[PDB]
Amino acid sequence: DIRQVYYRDKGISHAKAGRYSQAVMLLEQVYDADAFDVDVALHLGIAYVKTGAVDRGTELLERSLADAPDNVKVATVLGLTYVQVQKYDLAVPLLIKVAEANPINFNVRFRLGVALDNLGRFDEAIDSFKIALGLRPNEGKVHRAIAFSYEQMGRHEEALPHFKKANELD
């Protein structure tokens, strides 16, 4: 009744503030597969991945994606998690769309780049990494990444400056 609004509101806040174990503990008690609340599943999703229950969290995020395919945050979080467990094929489409809608999100763009480079899509990797550098030109790590993407294409002339700049910072 008012039990559940309190558990939901608090559990979600736990998750948002990084208190992930406490979010699992509360939200496990509201989450109901058959009365599907997407905010609950999202944030219990997040909290399971964070607490090492990666499969259960992934599954909940997929189910949330099925329920709300236009929810950007579900897509962001599923996308990045897929990068984290090396499901780069699944990640790229979710991360392209998220980056479209949210151009100021550096990590998304960067993980997109890294996802592309692991699929061998180097030209697209490079274009994403350039976009990531427009947002943080100081990012050594992007520089090492784009350098390696070029080198993998045998474009060594283009790699070196990026290698140099990644050391100038590192």
mmCIF file of all heavy atoms in Angstrom, residues 49-79:
data_model
loop_
_atom_site.group_PDB
_atom_site.id
_atom_site.type_symbol
_atom_site.label_atom_id
_atom_site.label_comp_id
_atom_site.label_asym_id
_atom_site.label_seq_id
_atom_site.Cartn_x
_atom_site.Cartn_y
_atom_site.Cartn_z
ATOM 1 N N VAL A 49 24.116 -5.390 -11.638
ATOM 2 C CA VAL A 49 25.335 -5.438 -12.418
ATOM 3 C C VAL A 49 26.430 -4.982 -11.465
ATOM 4 O O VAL A 49 27.412 -5.685 -11.272
ATOM 5 C CB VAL A 49 25.301 -4.531 -13.699
ATOM 6 C CG1 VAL A 49 26.772 -4.357 -14.271
ATOM 7 C CG2 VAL A 49 24.296 -5.102 -14.747
ATOM 8 N N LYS A 50 26.226 -3.805 -10.859
ATOM 9 C CA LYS A 50 27.153 -3.262 -9.841
ATOM 10 C C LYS A 50 27.507 -4.250 -8.716
ATOM 11 O O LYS A 50 28.655 -4.279 -8.282
ATOM 12 C CB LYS A 50 26.621 -1.962 -9.239
ATOM 13 C CG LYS A 50 26.847 -0.763 -10.122
ATOM 14 C CD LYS A 50 28.305 -0.630 -10.580
ATOM 15 C CE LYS A 50 28.714 0.801 -11.053
ATOM 16 N NZ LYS A 50 27.564 1.698 -11.424
ATOM 17 N N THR A 51 26.564 -5.080 -8.277
ATOM 18 C CA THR A 51 26.879 -6.019 -7.194
ATOM 19 C C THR A 51 27.347 -7.390 -7.672
ATOM 20 O O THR A 51 27.341 -8.341 -6.918
ATOM 21 C CB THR A 51 25.722 -6.148 -6.192
ATOM 22 O OG1 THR A 51 24.581 -6.685 -6.855
ATOM 23 C CG2 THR A 51 25.397 -4.756 -5.561
ATOM 24 N N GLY A 52 27.744 -7.489 -8.933
ATOM 25 C CA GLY A 52 28.298 -8.717 -9.453
ATOM 26 C C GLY A 52 27.317 -9.747 -9.955
ATOM 27 O O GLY A 52 27.737 -10.831 -10.366
ATOM 28 N N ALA A 53 26.027 -9.421 -9.972
ATOM 29 C CA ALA A 53 24.992 -10.313 -10.541
ATOM 30 C C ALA A 53 24.734 -9.853 -11.973
ATOM 31 O O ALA A 53 23.677 -9.341 -12.298
ATOM 32 C CB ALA A 53 23.705 -10.243 -9.710
ATOM 33 N N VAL A 54 25.722 -10.040 -12.825
ATOM 34 C CA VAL A 54 25.713 -9.434 -14.143
ATOM 35 C C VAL A 54 24.652 -10.044 -15.060
ATOM 36 O O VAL A 54 23.928 -9.308 -15.734
ATOM 37 C CB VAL A 54 27.118 -9.510 -14.808
ATOM 38 C CG1 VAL A 54 27.035 -8.945 -16.204
ATOM 39 C CG2 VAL A 54 28.184 -8.700 -13.980
ATOM 40 N N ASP A 55 24.537 -11.380 -15.059
ATOM 41 C CA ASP A 55 23.475 -12.046 -15.839
ATOM 42 C C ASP A 55 22.064 -11.652 -15.430
ATOM 43 O O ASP A 55 21.249 -11.385 -16.296
ATOM 44 C CB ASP A 55 23.620 -13.578 -15.807
ATOM 45 C CG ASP A 55 24.882 -14.050 -16.519
ATOM 46 O OD1 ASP A 55 25.421 -13.234 -17.308
ATOM 47 O OD2 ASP A 55 25.345 -15.210 -16.281
ATOM 48 N N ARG A 56 21.774 -11.647 -14.122
ATOM 49 C CA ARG A 56 20.431 -11.281 -13.682
ATOM 50 C C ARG A 56 20.205 -9.807 -14.025
ATOM 51 O O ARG A 56 19.159 -9.438 -14.416
ATOM 52 C CB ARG A 56 20.173 -11.552 -12.198
ATOM 53 C CG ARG A 56 20.725 -12.905 -11.737
ATOM 54 C CD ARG A 56 20.032 -13.499 -10.522
ATOM 55 N NE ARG A 56 20.415 -12.866 -9.259
ATOM 56 C CZ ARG A 56 21.425 -13.240 -8.458
ATOM 57 N NH1 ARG A 56 22.235 -14.260 -8.758
ATOM 58 N NH2 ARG A 56 21.635 -12.579 -7.323
ATOM 59 N N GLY A 57 21.216 -8.974 -13.899
ATOM 60 C CA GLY A 57 21.038 -7.570 -14.196
ATOM 61 C C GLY A 57 20.851 -7.339 -15.660
ATOM 62 O O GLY A 57 19.952 -6.584 -16.051
ATOM 63 N N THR A 58 21.671 -8.001 -16.466
ATOM 64 C CA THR A 58 21.534 -7.914 -17.940
ATOM 65 C C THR A 58 20.113 -8.324 -18.354
ATOM 66 O O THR A 58 19.374 -7.535 -18.977
ATOM 67 C CB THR A 58 22.609 -8.762 -18.678
ATOM 68 O OG1 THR A 58 23.914 -8.226 -18.359
ATOM 69 C CG2 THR A 58 22.408 -8.738 -20.176
ATOM 70 N N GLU A 59 19.721 -9.508 -17.943
ATOM 71 C CA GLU A 59 18.348 -9.973 -18.166
ATOM 72 C C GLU A 59 17.278 -8.940 -17.772
ATOM 73 O O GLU A 59 16.301 -8.755 -18.467
ATOM 74 C CB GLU A 59 18.081 -11.316 -17.444
ATOM 75 C CG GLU A 59 16.594 -11.715 -17.314
ATOM 76 C CD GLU A 59 15.834 -11.182 -15.995
ATOM 77 O OE1 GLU A 59 16.481 -10.965 -14.882
ATOM 78 O OE2 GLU A 59 14.556 -11.059 -16.088
ATOM 79 N N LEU A 60 17.455 -8.256 -16.669
ATOM 80 C CA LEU A 60 16.388 -7.344 -16.247
ATOM 81 C C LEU A 60 16.380 -6.120 -17.199
ATOM 82 O O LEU A 60 15.359 -5.539 -17.468
ATOM 83 C CB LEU A 60 16.654 -6.926 -14.799
ATOM 84 C CG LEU A 60 15.552 -6.801 -13.801
ATOM 85 C CD1 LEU A 60 14.507 -7.921 -13.889
ATOM 86 C CD2 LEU A 60 16.192 -6.821 -12.431
ATOM 87 N N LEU A 61 17.559 -5.741 -17.654
ATOM 88 C CA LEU A 61 17.756 -4.592 -18.563
ATOM 89 C C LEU A 61 17.223 -4.872 -19.953
ATOM 90 O O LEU A 61 16.587 -3.995 -20.586
ATOM 91 C CB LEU A 61 19.217 -4.221 -18.651
ATOM 92 C CG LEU A 61 19.745 -3.653 -17.320
ATOM 93 C CD1 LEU A 61 21.268 -3.603 -17.347
ATOM 94 C CD2 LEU A 61 19.121 -2.249 -17.017
ATOM 95 N N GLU A 62 17.372 -6.114 -20.369
ATOM 96 C CA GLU A 62 16.769 -6.547 -21.621
ATOM 97 C C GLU A 62 15.259 -6.559 -21.580
ATOM 98 O O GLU A 62 14.575 -6.219 -22.568
ATOM 99 C CB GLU A 62 17.259 -7.932 -21.961
ATOM 100 C CG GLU A 62 18.646 -7.843 -22.455
ATOM 101 C CD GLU A 62 19.332 -9.199 -22.538
ATOM 102 O OE1 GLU A 62 19.007 -10.092 -21.729
ATOM 103 O OE2 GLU A 62 20.202 -9.370 -23.424
ATOM 104 N N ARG A 63 14.740 -6.977 -20.428
ATOM 105 C CA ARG A 63 13.313 -7.037 -20.234
ATOM 106 C C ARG A 63 12.710 -5.598 -20.214
ATOM 107 O O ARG A 63 11.593 -5.351 -20.682
ATOM 108 C CB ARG A 63 13.075 -7.809 -18.965
ATOM 109 C CG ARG A 63 11.746 -8.337 -18.804
ATOM 110 C CD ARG A 63 11.715 -9.185 -17.509
ATOM 111 N NE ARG A 63 11.756 -10.621 -17.770
ATOM 112 C CZ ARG A 63 10.693 -11.344 -18.080
ATOM 113 N NH1 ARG A 63 9.490 -10.784 -18.158
ATOM 114 N NH2 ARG A 63 10.836 -12.634 -18.304
ATOM 115 N N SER A 64 13.492 -4.667 -19.683
ATOM 116 C CA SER A 64 13.137 -3.268 -19.631
ATOM 117 C C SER A 64 13.242 -2.684 -21.018
ATOM 118 O O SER A 64 12.425 -1.836 -21.373
ATOM 119 C CB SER A 64 14.036 -2.514 -18.620
ATOM 120 O OG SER A 64 14.456 -3.377 -17.545
ATOM 121 N N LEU A 65 14.216 -3.164 -21.817
ATOM 122 C CA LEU A 65 14.304 -2.703 -23.145
ATOM 123 C C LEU A 65 13.085 -3.160 -23.988
ATOM 124 O O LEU A 65 12.520 -2.375 -24.780
ATOM 125 C CB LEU A 65 15.626 -3.113 -23.774
ATOM 126 C CG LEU A 65 15.927 -2.404 -25.119
ATOM 127 C CD1 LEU A 65 16.341 -0.901 -24.927
ATOM 128 C CD2 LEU A 65 16.931 -3.243 -25.917
ATOM 129 N N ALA A 66 12.692 -4.418 -23.808
ATOM 130 C CA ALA A 66 11.438 -4.953 -24.383
ATOM 131 C C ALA A 66 10.204 -4.133 -23.963
ATOM 132 O O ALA A 66 9.323 -3.895 -24.755
ATOM 133 C CB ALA A 66 11.249 -6.425 -24.008
ATOM 134 N N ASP A 67 10.161 -3.672 -22.723
ATOM 135 C CA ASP A 67 9.006 -2.978 -22.206
ATOM 136 C C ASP A 67 8.974 -1.505 -22.647
ATOM 137 O O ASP A 67 7.900 -0.943 -22.913
ATOM 138 C CB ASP A 67 8.957 -3.107 -20.671
ATOM 139 C CG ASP A 67 7.819 -2.278 -20.041
ATOM 140 O OD1 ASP A 67 6.641 -2.761 -19.934
ATOM 141 O OD2 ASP A 67 8.122 -1.102 -19.696
ATOM 142 N N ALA A 68 10.151 -0.893 -22.718
ATOM 143 C CA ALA A 68 10.284 0.540 -23.029
ATOM 144 C C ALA A 68 11.470 0.661 -23.955
ATOM 145 O O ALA A 68 12.564 1.012 -23.564
ATOM 146 C CB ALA A 68 10.531 1.345 -21.795
ATOM 147 N N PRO A 69 11.257 0.334 -25.208
ATOM 148 C CA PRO A 69 12.376 0.514 -26.126
ATOM 149 C C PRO A 69 12.814 1.986 -26.350
ATOM 150 O O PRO A 69 13.912 2.198 -26.797
ATOM 151 C CB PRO A 69 11.886 -0.161 -27.408
ATOM 152 C CG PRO A 69 10.360 -0.090 -27.307
ATOM 153 C CD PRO A 69 9.997 -0.055 -25.858
ATOM 154 N N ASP A 70 12.007 2.972 -25.979
ATOM 155 C CA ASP A 70 12.391 4.387 -26.193
ATOM 156 C C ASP A 70 13.011 5.050 -24.952
ATOM 157 O O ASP A 70 13.448 6.188 -24.986
ATOM 158 C CB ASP A 70 11.190 5.183 -26.706
ATOM 159 C CG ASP A 70 10.631 4.617 -28.051
ATOM 160 O OD1 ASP A 70 11.445 4.314 -29.007
ATOM 161 O OD2 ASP A 70 9.368 4.490 -28.134
ATOM 162 N N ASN A 71 13.055 4.310 -23.860
ATOM 163 C CA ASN A 71 13.769 4.728 -22.624
ATOM 164 C C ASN A 71 15.325 4.786 -22.816
ATOM 165 O O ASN A 71 16.005 3.738 -22.942
ATOM 166 C CB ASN A 71 13.387 3.735 -21.491
ATOM 167 C CG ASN A 71 13.848 4.190 -20.108
ATOM 168 O OD1 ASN A 71 15.046 4.462 -19.881
ATOM 169 N ND2 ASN A 71 12.898 4.209 -19.155
ATOM 170 N N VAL A 72 15.861 5.998 -22.799
ATOM 171 C CA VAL A 72 17.241 6.277 -23.186
ATOM 172 C C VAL A 72 18.215 5.702 -22.169
ATOM 173 O O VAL A 72 19.250 5.154 -22.537
ATOM 174 C CB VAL A 72 17.485 7.798 -23.306
ATOM 175 C CG1 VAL A 72 18.932 8.079 -23.482
ATOM 176 C CG2 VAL A 72 16.668 8.382 -24.460
ATOM 177 N N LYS A 73 17.846 5.827 -20.897
ATOM 178 C CA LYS A 73 18.661 5.406 -19.806
ATOM 179 C C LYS A 73 18.764 3.902 -19.781
ATOM 180 O O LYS A 73 19.851 3.355 -19.501
ATOM 181 C CB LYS A 73 18.072 5.898 -18.487
ATOM 182 C CG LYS A 73 18.339 7.376 -18.112
ATOM 183 C CD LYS A 73 17.827 8.467 -19.123
ATOM 184 C CE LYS A 73 16.330 8.789 -18.982
ATOM 185 N NZ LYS A 73 15.439 7.698 -19.583
ATOM 186 N N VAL A 74 17.656 3.211 -20.055
ATOM 187 C CA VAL A 74 17.712 1.699 -20.130
ATOM 188 C C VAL A 74 18.715 1.337 -21.209
ATOM 189 O O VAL A 74 19.557 0.437 -21.016
ATOM 190 C CB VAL A 74 16.323 1.057 -20.456
ATOM 191 C CG1 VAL A 74 16.431 -0.373 -20.885
ATOM 192 C CG2 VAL A 74 15.359 1.168 -19.307
ATOM 193 N N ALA A 75 18.645 2.086 -22.331
ATOM 194 C CA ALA A 75 19.476 1.809 -23.501
ATOM 195 C C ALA A 75 20.974 2.121 -23.196
ATOM 196 O O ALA A 75 21.914 1.386 -23.583
ATOM 197 C CB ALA A 75 18.969 2.633 -24.745
ATOM 198 N N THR A 76 21.184 3.234 -22.507
ATOM 199 C CA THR A 76 22.549 3.610 -22.133
ATOM 200 C C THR A 76 23.190 2.484 -21.271
ATOM 201 O O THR A 76 24.288 2.074 -21.450
ATOM 202 C CB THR A 76 22.523 4.938 -21.347
ATOM 203 O OG1 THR A 76 21.868 5.960 -22.131
ATOM 204 C CG2 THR A 76 23.895 5.369 -21.017
ATOM 205 N N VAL A 77 22.446 1.989 -20.354
ATOM 206 C CA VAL A 77 22.998 1.254 -19.304
ATOM 207 C C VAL A 77 23.246 -0.169 -19.786
ATOM 208 O O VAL A 77 24.239 -0.784 -19.412
ATOM 209 C CB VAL A 77 22.006 1.255 -18.103
ATOM 210 C CG1 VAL A 77 22.399 0.232 -17.192
ATOM 211 C CG2 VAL A 77 21.976 2.708 -17.419
ATOM 212 N N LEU A 78 22.294 -0.665 -20.592
ATOM 213 C CA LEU A 78 22.384 -1.942 -21.320
ATOM 214 C C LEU A 78 23.496 -1.869 -22.331
ATOM 215 O O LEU A 78 24.372 -2.732 -22.365
ATOM 216 C CB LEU A 78 21.021 -2.252 -22.013
ATOM 217 C CG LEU A 78 20.922 -3.615 -22.683
ATOM 218 C CD1 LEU A 78 21.316 -4.798 -21.754
ATOM 219 C CD2 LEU A 78 19.574 -3.819 -23.309
ATOM 220 N N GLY A 79 23.499 -0.825 -23.144
ATOM 221 C CA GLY A 79 24.595 -0.635 -24.040
ATOM 222 C C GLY A 79 25.951 -0.760 -23.353
ATOM 223 O O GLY A 79 26.756 -1.576 -23.741
#
